Paper text:
The N-terminal AEP domain is responsible for the DNA polymerization activity, whereas the DNA unwinding activity is catalyzed by the central SF3 helicase domain. The middle PriCT2 and D5_N domains and the C-terminal Tail domain all contribute to the DNA unwinding activity of C962R. C962R preferentially works on forked DNA, and likely functions in Base-excision repair (BER) or other repair pathway in ASFV.
Therefore, instead of regular dsDNAs or dsDNAs with 3′-overhang, ssDNA was directly utilized in the cryo-EM study of the C962R-DNA-AMPPNP complex. However, different from the apo-form C962R structure, the two C962R hexamers are tilted with respect to each other in the ternary complex structure. In the complex structure, six AMPPNP molecules were captured by the C962R hexamer. The DNA is located in the central channel of the C962R hexamer. The two loops are termed DNA-interacting loop (DIL) 1 and 2, respectively. Both DIL-1 and DIL-2 loops are well defined in the complex structures, whereas they are completely disordered in the apo structure.
Numbering used by the authors:
A (entry chain A): 9 to 274, 284 to 918, 936 to 949
B (entry chain B): 285 to 687
C (entry chain F): 413 to 718, 723 to 825
Write the structure that this text describes.
DNA sequence: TTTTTTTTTT
């Protein structure tokens, strides 16, 4: 709380400003680094260390006394070296709250016994000398605890002699009884053993967040060599007129009344955390916040590691905070915690997978202790606004309000520059606020941060009211007329500037200035990059591990896009799940084909690279083609799935410049399908290999420039007629799969045909719009994805399915002539190796095509290149003359006769976990 | 404190206090009859999740019904309010019912509320009014008549509910019309809101006339001077523009545009809105909270074969299509144009030699459906090849939202 | 105080960190030199970044200039407290009042906008944009800038004044032959090209992709005999060079006939300022056009656009499975073409009895080309090969002795 | 403003 008092005094007290100007301009010639032997005076408010000579020491004492004359607050400590004045510090615990008066008779008796101890325990200079004593008392007793000081500037002693005197005094029964009779209930431990060497407080100064001691009276002791028995003590008078700063200084050499008695002579680690706190207010706020965490966060390894990672990610130099936090449990820290802290900090400097920051720490502190967190953070807000109010005499401006707003809500809004060069605001949607369906726990995009607009006029006005209350309280306090006039002027200016926060232009300016503070570099770049995180209607779904986890709590994953479907665990007994499973059983009769189709459609969840396959559907109509594909698109939503125009796959592309928003619809999509085609349709093979391959594609979007993105969509196509594929490329055909429909739905099915079923309009008219069936199907998809990951390591290429492979082979054979030649005539016979040259095989192909298919004039080079385009690469080795030779196969050259050489029981979705 | 939870809500929510004052004006039938009581409970639950004490207090207006299963009734109605996604009413209906059943008491209560809000704002800041203060008061005055939401273009769009009597286009009664600029709000800021400032001036002058300490009189005189200086700014164009720009954040309603005109069973007509959810169809001539914007200029009336125009149309239909079964099927197919949702994958091809009434009936259907629900389509949209890759196609865009 | 005074002081304070120039659109564009320890994108250190709005300057106006303002206030108060004649004291009091009136304007949005608008004239540097990335011997990398103007190549991790804006995210490391990724890439590359002379010639040609200036422009007809799986190495070269320095091109550019007198062409606008260009995956066995070769293989300014003209700097590679058809006898075309045929495939279920079929590994394509370590290892390999070529044959690929390439051509 | 549309190309 001392910050407010310090700023106010530096504002309305001109003498404090003069003292600071001296310390920063004229005494600046005597700076000393911490730990230097020359240091004699330290200002721990700013942490600086100084070394001032006698004349400059007198000047400094004069200026503090002038500041002390006006009642200012400060904290200056003189560094007691090897030789200085003796010091005695007492902390009194009392039977009751009654203050021990420390009467001058009692003080005289105590001083007499102290002199007896010092004279019998140390040598004294010859002749007659006078020793000055002073006593500063605490302002109040708290819970029966009190304190007072016995400082002796005149008795110049060494540290060892002072420590011996302190120990003897503590163990002396006479002094203990003297203190006890006055009211001290703990005379044996009241005196601080370290009082010999602790720095001495200059009079008028007070400890940080502590009230200053009050000087009660002074005493002078006279002793003589010729009279070592009698100990006269005289009470010092006129104590109000002396420069008490100089006269109470233990190390002082040029005191007005204090004369030196030349009698007998004989860690930065803690400072680093304070340095970090002073040079960074956020570090101080975090240190205040971290104390609210329960003990589990520094005892259990996972929570402690999370805290360490968050601190390291917040700032690279926040290590002292982590070290201090780990020291909450000395046992765990000492038993290997140091090495663990080293390793964790190194990993945080290395790793990039645990992305947590101070937002999580703030959330944990708020959850565990809401009221204390609120009080601390509101005190922080008031403190931050206080410097801006005081320094500029109440004339608040846009930048001041933007800074306070960032301090108030910095962990909820992020602004980044998009491709257009315009600043775009993002907000993290917490529960219990107006929001669209399904956008909870995600970063939503806002054209204009209206929530911040409301927040400026609704919540910041409370801090304004607190500032006004503070000013009114200071006005009511009795002060100097000049101080009252200054506070009146400040109140008038602040009231003039108080209503600006309700103005439209002022708020626009504040938010425009706040865009610079909330800016986070590369935020859009990392948005929605992680393919294992999928946004859902009730949180975010994480498929990083098996089983998948639903996150219904705070998180910092940069996720923006989402689907409205709420995720629920897979349950076969749900009526909608049973209905959907029966529908799947009805749509696809073959068990292996159904399993392969469901495994393939499960990969639509994953938005990353995959095995580069495309599915072709064949069906005459009314066989569920549109239902299943559209259900997948509906459950995946618009952001992750979209219908695609077939011309995008069957035509020559537009110039790179030409936007092609239809092509830009493939960005970020895990699934895409074309529901419509023509009778006569030739799919373009260059488009096909361009869109099914795992790689980069480029196109422009409306109001944007050139851009490249990875192609990560699951592609499905359906039609009433077979597509035309005008190529024999083995690389093209391995990318394709084909399936043909069997079951047909009709209003009046023939009972003698197992492939005719009664249609139910509800499937497409109602059972695709009910959210319940949608989310049940999403659960089924998640379950099938998990099953694929746990049984085939996610590789769809290794799924066993005779029906799909047989139908794809038939489909290819119906168009690829050379494939027919190889399949029907070129048998792979190890018993009939008969090494052939490529020209011989080309002649065989020409003969077969002429005799069996059609007469045609062939080209040897083209035919050779085309059998280089087939499965013959398994056998086409290199001859010694480097000529292509076929090996290990027999050719049926011309009209040669060929020569040698499961059903589910109860749960089809759980079929064969053992293969 | 559980019995005092109602007062705990009162001290924290001014809107709850205003509703409690309003709810006392409802006639006894709204807590005696089950339908009206259920409607009130649903509206209270939809307005706020924590408004349960208000519903419990209101249900106690008839203790005999409350004791005889009323508590369990209130509990399952509260649960169904979260369960039911079709019963969409809010505090707007409660305010309308209270205004209908007691105009003077409702008027005085709500005017007292306006005066209290404005007086608090004036006293808190010594009469220096700003845009957000008048925006807050205007939202209090018309929080249930204007709604603003961000369209697809990133531009805030104002919507207004049209009531009888006010100037309007023909057929837009009982619907949310779209306002480029909130004209009525601009008029209301200067015309109606100015009378509350007159009440503030009367209050200040009355306190000035009251005998007080000289310091109090000086403070009130300074406050009066500041308020008179700030009073004329409500007639300034720039000040009103800023006030309305700030009011867009208070009138904001998330997902309003998303749900606009999505229900296919609700059809906007010239004299209200037509609901075809259940047979017979019902016409809504009264206040409602259905988010309906598009409409047709046709005024709906119940079917009557004795109407001369109905007789003429039936005779014309008989003349055009001779066969009875064909006529019934054609009328059934054309009737599906009323419904704007998913329907059977059918198309009708009609062939004729010419001058045989084909375009008469086909165009009459589109004339009676209006432009927002029906449209003529280009033949090239059906007999020509699709445009190459991506090109804008406004002809195909005409298909959105049309039956 | 007014806008120009604060603009002058801001230029005096940060004149060596921000530069503004007028682009082709007539808009003043701010550029900032990115020093270590400040918020930035990954890899933009030690380079000039384009700023639509000088955010850092906006912060610096209100965060650091206020300290100079405070120093001025301290000076004024010190003179005010000094014993002076009443006239001087009144003058200083008036000056302090006026300064305090003007002190708070530096936090105003309109005032800061005006200050920055006036500062756009002081920070202006003529022809700054025209000199950006013009030096071909300087290559921007993730951890600084790589200089290939001297042997060996040198990486800069300190202050410099080279006008570099574009860069690749690949971080440069010295070529370590014992690095695991380096060993893997070297073994795979040895597997790809069986002939040693052909391997050295191919790597020396491919290493010229780093240099962005003029070069011999010899097209390489890499016929992937055996359907090797050509995507790996060729896409890896473009991946390590990045989009700013490498370009993907369509085979339709070489087989399509020359355009009409007004029809726009989409290929040359994506071809300018690049160090590498590649054509891949032929399946139609397309016949190439001689005018399309002349449109690019000869050194000079290309003219077709979507009109606009510029120089040719891309290293070109043509990948084929099935032979192209060159329908000309022109010795001027044949002297600029080079032909090579591969003999190795890496595919699924190879025969163990021959070395020319090897087991495929899909994780190569799925992760390793996306693995930063593999990419930077390959970049180090490319840098080493460029250094070896420069130090052995003076960088001319014409004089590289390779019997295999000559015989196959 | 500024872009997209239109224009231009298929
Ligand atoms: N599991 C099912 N059980 C019963 N009826 C079903 C089922 N699945 C789909 N339907 C019916 O199938 C009818 C047509 O299916 P739909 O998927 O729209 O046709 P389609 O096969 O795509 N034919 P097409 O539109 O010509 O492409 C729907 O109207 C439903 O009545
Ligand atoms: N019920 C009716 N009784 C008598 N005349 C009628 C009737 N319905 C329509 N007509 C008239 O018949 C004429 C033909 O109507 P219209 O609908 O324009 O023709 P159409 O069948 O669409 N012919 P077309 O477009 O020329 O091939 C018009 O003059 C109508 O007014
Ligand atoms: N050196 C190698 N060792 C082992 N496997 C390899 C090697 N190089 C490539 N492969 C694998 O061989 C396959 C060929 O991949 P890819 O380079 O995409 O082939 P491609 O025929 O050029 N493809 P595309 O142009 O897309 O049709 C992949 O499974 C690679 O992982
Ligand atoms: Mg269909």
């Amino acid at each position: 709380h001392d910050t407010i008092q310090l700023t106010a005094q530096r504002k309305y007290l001109a003498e404090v400003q003069a003292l600071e100007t001296l310390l920063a301009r004229e005494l600046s010639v005597f700076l000393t680094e911490p730990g230097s032997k020359k240091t004699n005076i330290i200002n721990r408010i700013t942490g600086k260390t100084y070394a001032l000579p006698s004349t400059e020491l007198l000047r400094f004492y004069e200026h503090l006394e002038q500041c002390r004359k006006q009642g200012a607050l400060m904290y200056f400590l003189e560094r007691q070296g090897t030789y200085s004045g003796l010091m005695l510090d007492y902390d009194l615990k009392l039977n009751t709250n009654a203050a021990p008066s420390l009467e001058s008779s009692v003080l005289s008796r105590l001083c007499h016994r102290i002199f007896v101890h010092i004279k019998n325990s140390s040598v004294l200079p010859e002749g007659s000398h006078k020793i000055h004593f002073f006593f500063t008392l605490k302002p109040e007793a708290v819970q029966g605890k009190y304190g007072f000081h016995v400082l002796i500037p005149g008795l110049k002693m060494a540290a060892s002699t002072k420590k011996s005197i302190i120990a003897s005094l503590q163990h002396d029964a006479t002094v203990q009884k003297i203190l006890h009779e006055q009211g001290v209930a703990n005379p044996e431990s009241c005196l601080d053993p370290h009082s010999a060497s602790v720095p001495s407080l200059l009079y008028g100064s007070s400890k940080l967040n502590h009230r200053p001691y009050q000087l009660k009276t002074g005493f002078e002791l006279v002793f003589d060599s010729s009279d070592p028995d009698y100990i006269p003590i005289h009470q010092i008078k006129n104590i109000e007129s002396y420069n008490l700063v100089s006269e109470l200084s233990l190390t002082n050499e040029q005191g007005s009344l204090v004369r030196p008695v030349y009698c007998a002579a004989d860690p930065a680690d803690d400072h680093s955390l304070s340095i970090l706190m002073l040079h960074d207010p956020e570090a101080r706020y975090l240190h205040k916040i971290l104390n609210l965490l329960p003990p589990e966060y520094y005892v259990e390894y996972p929570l402690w590691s999370n805290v360490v990672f968050a601190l390291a990610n917040t700032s690279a130099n926040y290590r002292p905070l982590a070290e201090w936090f780990s020291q909450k449990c000395p046992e765990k820290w000492n038993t290997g915690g140091k090495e663990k802290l080293e390793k964790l900090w190194n990993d945080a400097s290395r790793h990039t997978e645990k992305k947590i920051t101070k937002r999580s720490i703030m959330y944990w502190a708020h959850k565990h202790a809401p009221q204390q967190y609120k009080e601390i953070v509101e005190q922080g807000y008031f403190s931050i606004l206080a410097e801006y109010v005081y320094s500029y005499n109440g004339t608040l401006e846009h930048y001041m309000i933007a800074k306070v707003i960032y301090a108030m809500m910095g962990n909820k809004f992020v602004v980044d520059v998009d491709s257009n060069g315009k600043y775009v605001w993002f907000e993290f949607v917490l529960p219990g606020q107006p929001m669209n369906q399904g956008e909870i726990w995600k970063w939503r995009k806002e054209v204009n941060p209206d929530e911040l607009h409301i927040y400026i006029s609704e919540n910041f006005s409370r801090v304004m009211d607190r500032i006004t209350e503070h000013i009114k309280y200071h006005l009511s306090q009795p002060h100097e007329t000049n101080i009252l006039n200054y506070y009146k002027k400040l109140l008038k200016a602040f009231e003039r500037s108080k209503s600006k926060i309700f103005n439209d232009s002022f708020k626009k300016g504040v938010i425009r200035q706040a865009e610079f503070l909330f800016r986070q570099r590369s935020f859009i770049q990392t948005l929605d990059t992680n393919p294992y995180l999928l946004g859902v209607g009730n949180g975010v779904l994480s498929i990083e591990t098996i089983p998948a986890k639903l996150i219904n709590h705070f998180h910092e994953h940069p996720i923006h896009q989402y689907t409205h479907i709420c995720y629920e665990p897979f349950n076969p007994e749900n009526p909608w799940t049973k209905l959907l499973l029966n529908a799947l059983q009805d749509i696809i009769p073959e068990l292996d084909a159904r399993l392969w189709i469901m495994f393939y459609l499960s990969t639509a969840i994953f938005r990353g690279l995959k095995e580069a396959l495309m599915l072709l559907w064949l069906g005459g109509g009314c066989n569920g083609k549109t239902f299943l594909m559209r259900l997948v698109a509906m459950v995946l939503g618009d952001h992750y799935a979209s219908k695609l125009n077939i011309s995008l796959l069957t035509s020559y592309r537009e110039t790179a410049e030409k936007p092609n928003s239809a092509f830009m619809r493939l960005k970020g999509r895990g699934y895409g399908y074309f529901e419509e085609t023509n009778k006569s349709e030739i799919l373009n093979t260059s488009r096909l290999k361009e869109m099914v391959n795992p790689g980069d594609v480029t196109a422009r979007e409306l109001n944007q420039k050139q851009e490249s993105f990875q192609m990560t969509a699951t592609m499905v196509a359906a039609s009433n007629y077979n597509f035309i594929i005008d190529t024999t490329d083995h690389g093209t055909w391995r990318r394709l799969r084909h399936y043909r429909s069997k079951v047909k739905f009709c209003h009046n099915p023939d009972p003698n045909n197992s492939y005719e079923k009664k249609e139910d309009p509800r499937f497409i008219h109602e059972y695709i719009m009910d959210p319940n069936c949608q989310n049940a199907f999403f659960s089924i998809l998640v379950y099938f994805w998990e099953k694929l990951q746990k049984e085939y390591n996610g590789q769809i290429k290794k799924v066993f399915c005779p029906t799909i492979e047989s139908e794809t082979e038939a489909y290819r054979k119906s168009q690829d002539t050379l494939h027919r030649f190889i399949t029907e005539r070129v048998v792979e016979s190890p018993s009939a190796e008969t090494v052939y040259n490529l020209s011989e095989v080309v002649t065989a192909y020409a003969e077969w095509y002429n005799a069996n298919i059609n007469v045609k004039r062939h080209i040897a080079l083209e035919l050779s290149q085309e059998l280089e385009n087939s499965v013959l690469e398994k056998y086409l080795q290199w001859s010694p003359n480097k000529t292509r030779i076929l090996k290990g196969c027999r050719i049926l050259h011309k009209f040669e006769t060929l020569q040698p050489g499961c059903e589910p029981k109860n749960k089809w979705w759980e079929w064969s976990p053992n293969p």
